[PDB]
Amino acid sequence: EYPTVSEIPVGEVRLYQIADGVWSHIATQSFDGAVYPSNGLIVRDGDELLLIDTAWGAKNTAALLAEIEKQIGLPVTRAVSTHFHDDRVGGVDVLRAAGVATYASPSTRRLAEVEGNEIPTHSLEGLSSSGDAVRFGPVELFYPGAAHSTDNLVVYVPSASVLYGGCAIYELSRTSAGNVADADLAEWPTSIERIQQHYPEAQFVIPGHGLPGGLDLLKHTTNVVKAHTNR
Ligand SMILES: O=P(O)(O)Cc1ccccc1-n1cc(-c2ccccc2)nn1
Ligand SMILES: [Zn+2]
Ligand SMILES: [Zn+2]
Question: In which residues is Zn(2+) 3 bound (predicted)?
Fold first, then answer.
């Protein structure tokens, strides 16, 4: 079963195999004074791996590479960061020193720079307008519009029907919006609806944090966001 925040000391990383050649990676990090889990994705592309998102920090991202080498044994050659916050680009310097080609949208790179976060080297063209989709090896990258952040991307794995929603999709146990300093509350449900309409065949939905589910995580997220908007 899926690794949980209480089972992973900070600094450690677990892998969870969803399908043939598709894994999630799970780490934990302290914010304020709580402990919180975070998901990313790993997708096999021939004899190499595509990493989606760092493991929230340099120390966790170094352990992520160690766990991959220990559990999978294939080289991580590219990585995509789905938005500019530290849970998605923190560790990008680690990835880069290990010879990983790091990528993010121009929006993400610009915002990471403004915010003082690590900046992926390569720019993902063709994702600046809501509804844009591009192919990236074994996945498709989709910009649904502004939601958790103005730059958030989601990732679909066609071969396995896996939708990685990143931090634009909440796990079921999250009933409140939390920190929305950089979210677009007014557009968030509209962006979620673009996800639903573009990936209605998705079978396994991974939130940015916590337990996977199905497409019902999209309506759950809409419910939470709309309830936060209303007070
Ligand atoms: O914003 P992201 O969703 O991606 C997570 C994140 C990442 C980095 C730093 C902080 C946080 N935050 C976590 C929370 C929170 C969530 C549920 C209950 C109580 C608090 N708020 N912020
Ligand atoms: Zn964020
Ligand atoms: Zn997050």
Answer: 87, 167
